Amino acid sequence: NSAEAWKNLGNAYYKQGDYQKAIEYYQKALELDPNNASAWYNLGNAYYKQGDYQKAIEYYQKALELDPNNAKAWYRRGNAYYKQGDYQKAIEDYQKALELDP
Amino acid sequence: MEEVD
Known about the structure:
CATH class of chain A: Mainly Alpha
Oligomer: heterodimer
Largest interface: A-B, 9 and 3 residues
Structural class of chain B: little secondary structure
Helix content of chain A: over 70%
Shape of chain A: globular
CATH architecture of chain A: Alpha Horseshoe
Number of helices of chain A: 6
Number of strands of chain A: 0
Distance between the termini of chain A: 36 Å
């Protein structure tokens, strides 16, 4: 029941744009439930929003390994790669996000 | 700006 509260704490801090503390409670959520792709995704979102694209790529990767149908994650890892000047993997991720968009 | 699901 308990990463149902950590995730929500992280969510509540995310919703208010407090990424530093959002990360703190997203990481606690991931300690208890290391399988929830949604946790990997939102933690990926938090780093991305800070401009920590290196870590954003890292965490989106596993969110996409556990849920490859997450088109939003594909797209955001695509921006991350683009920011880093990785234009090949950016293209690669962008297309995969659009193939899930009718 | 980006949303959340």
